[PDB]
């Protein structure tokens, strides 16, 4: 356990995620009958502003197949929330043309390094080549 978990924050995250999924059409609840599903969704909607009861709501009506996805989404949300405080711990997202990405991933898989490590090593070698020439 590296990042401390805060209930009033992660519960709001879970509520927002479930509301988003419901608005997206995902079946939040395990009830195939539409009446029970709608009733549970209404309970959730009126359940806003409550961690201790949204957790119970999840335990009681949550769709079995979404547990893993919700858990990993909350994991990622927690990690990003804690890393977004400092500049050096943040992550920069870019888009690479498919050939360039293909070659870079080929190198990374070949050497066992990650994309960041592979690019760092390559840049260091480029600098070393510059110094060699210079």
């Amino acid at each position: 356990m590296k990042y401390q978990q805060l209930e009033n924050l992660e519960c709001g995250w879970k509520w927002a995620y479930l509301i988003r999924k419901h608005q997206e059409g995902e079946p939040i609840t395990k009830y195939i009958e539409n009446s029970a599903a709608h009733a549970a969704v209404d309970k959730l909607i009126k359940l806003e502003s409550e961690p201790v009861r949204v957790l119970e709501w999840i335990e009681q009506h949550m769709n079995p197949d979404l547990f893993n996805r919700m858990k990993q989404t909350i994991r990622a949300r927690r990690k990003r929330h804690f890393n977004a405080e400092h500049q050096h711990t943040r992550k920069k997202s870019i888009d690479l043309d498919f050939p360039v990405w293909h070659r870079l991933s080929a190198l990374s898989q070949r050497r066992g390094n990650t994309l960041s490590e592979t690019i760092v090593q390559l840049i260091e070698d480029a600098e070393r080549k510059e110094k060699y020439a210079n």
């Binding site: 539409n34 009446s35 709608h38 009733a39 209404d42 909607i45 009126k46």
Partner: protein, 212 residues
């Protein structure tokens, strides 16, 4: 959201149950009345919201069933919330005979309008007169008093079937009637070309017909 029909009931089922025709149809159905093509309004109502009504009535442990002929009715289960009852053997005789008349072309001139006398004549033609009479009275041997008793019993069974929708009395005449496709149920034991003794077990298993 709250105060929203989908919370408790599907929209179409609620619309069906709020229609002006629902109460008469429900009372008749629970009474045991079969629905044929003649009751155009009620038949169309059942057709439009057929699925909602089967699932609603399932809550009573009774199946709203549409036979292939196109007539709806209710079949209670062993765990029925609505009581259940079985027709008399004489009722079976008259229903089978009624199905015959529906399918019989000799009486085509009648154009579907039949009198109880003709029904009794056909019944005695196809059945065993005295051995059928045995059920009317255990001590019958062809006495005309018992003959009139059997005629009266046939008339009474015909009236009960009228209550069940298998037959309609004419808008002004209670001595003449028109047959309905519901009578086809009386042939459910022979609609399939198999051994009678296996079809009877299949039906009784399905709850279609109990024995006597």
């Amino acid at each position: 959201s709250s105060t929203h029909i989908e919370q408790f009931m599907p929209v179409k089922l609620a619309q069906a149950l709020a229609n002006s025709l629902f109460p008469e149809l429900d009372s008749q159905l629970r009474a045991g009345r079969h629905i044929g093509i003649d009751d155009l309004d009620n038949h169309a109502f059942l057709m439009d919201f057929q699925e909602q009504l089967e699932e609603f009535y399932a809550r009573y442990n009774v199946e709203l069933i549409r036979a292939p002929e196109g007539f709806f009715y209710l079949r209670p289960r062993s765990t029925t919330l609505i009581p259940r009852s079985v027709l008399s053997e004489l009722d079976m005789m008259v229903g089978k005979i009624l199905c015959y008349l529906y399918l019989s072309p000799e009486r085509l001139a009648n154009q579907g309008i039949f009198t109880s006398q003709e029904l009794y004549e056909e019944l005695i033609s196809l059945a065993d007169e005295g051995k059928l009479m045995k059920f009317v009275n255990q001590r019958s041997s062809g006495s005309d008093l018992d003959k009139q008793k059997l005629q009266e019993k046939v008339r009474t069974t015909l009236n009960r079937l009228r209550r069940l929708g298998m037959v309609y009395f004419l808008p002004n005449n209670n001595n003449k009637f028109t047959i309905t496709e519901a009578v086809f149920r009386f042939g459910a034991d022979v609609r399939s070309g198999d051994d009678p003794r296996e079809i009877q077990l299949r039906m009784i298993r399905d709850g279609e017909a109990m024995p006597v």
